[model samples]
Every structure is written in C-alpha cells, then in structure tokens.
Target chain A: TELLIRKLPFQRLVREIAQDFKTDLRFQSSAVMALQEACEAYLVGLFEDTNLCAIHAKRVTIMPKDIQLARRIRGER
Target chain B: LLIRKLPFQRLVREIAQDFKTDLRFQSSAVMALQEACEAYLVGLFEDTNLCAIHAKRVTIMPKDIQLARRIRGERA
Candidate 1:
C-alpha cells in the first residue's frame, strides 16, 4: 500500500517515548540525528512518489565514513 | 508514560503487551503504532529505523527536539 505522506506522528511520540528516552543519552541523540536525515530524504523523495514505508525501509546505520574527523569507534578508540 | 521503543518485530510484542487486553483497540492500535513509527522515520531519516524499534529487547526511547515537530497533524 502507498503510505500516507505528511502525517508524521510527533506528539504521540512525545507523549509516548520522550520521557522514557530522556534518561538514555546516546539513543536520544542518535534518534534525533537519524530522524533529521530521514525527514530530509523522505521529503525530497515524496515528490518523486516515494511511499512512507519505502522511506523508512532501512535502519540508520551510522558509518564513520558519514562523519568528518571521526574516530573508528569499532576499535581505533 | 511508558513511552518506550521496540524493534519493529518486537514492537508487535511490546504493543501487544501494552494493550493486549483491550480487544477493542488492539489490532487498530498496533497498526497505528507501526504506521506512526514508519511515518516519523520516513520524515526524519533516509535509512530505515524500523528495526531500531524492532528486534532488540525493549530499550529506553531516544528523545529529540524536532521530533515533536515531526509528527504533528497525524490523526486529523
């Protein structure tokens, strides 16, 4: 099915996950960064007829290549 | 105020636990929950964060500032 675009569920999340996520730091920061990228790409793709499901099809894997002057936390840390 | 997140697959289970007894709203609620997660992910990231909330054992939710702005006007 073609997923609905533009009706993202922000409040439900605030009401739902914010407090729970608040205590944990990394996941919170990561989720926001992840969400920002997701939003920009999805919006760009929407005009091209991308569906919501397809937009959210992959998990946000933070690669060192995507970061500038970053450490290889995998081991180089 | 549980506001916890689960991996997509485990989302089913967590959601099931959250409202399992509410036979009237279980199925629809599950759909809404998944769709909401999908929608926000679509709006906020290129890579899918579905599994971020899926297979792993339930973890604390990741909070954000813009997230509140992300999911506005959902149920209208």
Candidate 2:
C-alpha cells in the first residue's frame, strides 16, 4: 500500500486519501495528522498516528471515513 | 468521491453516498453511483482497491453495524 500510494500522482493520492478519509474516521484523522507531521517525520518514515492526522488536516475536511482508511492504509490499525 | 469534493454538498453527499454504497450496498441506485465513483477512481488510478478502501473507511462508523448503517443512511 505504501509503495502503491506513493507511486500515484499527487492529486490522485489526495483523492485517494480523501476517499479513505471520508470512509474511515480514525484513519482519516491519522492521515490528517501525518500530512501535518510529514514535514517533521519525512526523514524518518513516520511510524505513528501523527502522520495520518496531519494529512487529514492538510485537506481540512475530508469525508468522515478517511480517518480510518489512512490508518489502515498505513497499517497503523 | 465526486460528491465529497463538492463544497456545500460535501457532507450531505458524503453521507448519502455512504448510505448507498456501504449501508444498503446490496442493491440501490445511489449505491450504484458510489460504485461508479469508486470504479472511476480505480480506472483512473491504480494501487488501492475500492473494496478494501471502503472496508478501511467502515471502521469510522459507530462500533455497531446497525447504528453504522443507520448513520450512513442519514437515519442518525
């Protein structure tokens, strides 16, 4: 999933993240955090929920489910 | 996916789409639309199957399936 989403275009990645974000709550929150924290954890492959949370925030408001999708996508939960 | 991108309608449509696609997905018009949106995304991009993606999102709903379904249907 990592390699796959990574290879996708940025827009598609955003779309994908948004879709999942809408789909899953926890995952989306985590992704939102990840997006925000990516700036800090980029060097060390962020291994926590912060990365997901940041990403979710980056988009501001994705669907409710994206929170969970982001976590599942990253294998956090 | 498409509706979520909308501004005013994003939340409403997102709920509606969730109902059709996941809640009553067994058979529904809106469900078809949700599937179509997922297919469209899949057709355009790769890596990230719609079913798994949907499954991942499912976790967001209330822990109970019945409540979750109801919520998705806007019954909540």
TM-score of each model, in listed order? 0.21, 0.17
Query: TM-score of the candidate numbered 2?
Result: 0.17
TM-score of chain B of 1: 0.34
Where in model 2 is the C-alpha error above 4 Å?
A1-60, B1-47, B51-76
Candidate 1: which docking quality band? incorrect
Give the per-residue lDDT digits (tens) of candidate 1, residues A6-71. 334543443356566666434454565456567556545432222222222232553323221111
Give the number of colliding residue pairs in candidate 2: 47
What shift in Å separates residue B19 of candidate 1 from its native position after superposition?
Answer: 8.9
The digit string of per-residue lDDT tens for model 2 on B35-67 reads 677674443232134223344453332232322
- In terms of docking quality, model 2 is incorrect
Worst 10 residues of 1 chain B by lDDT: B64-73
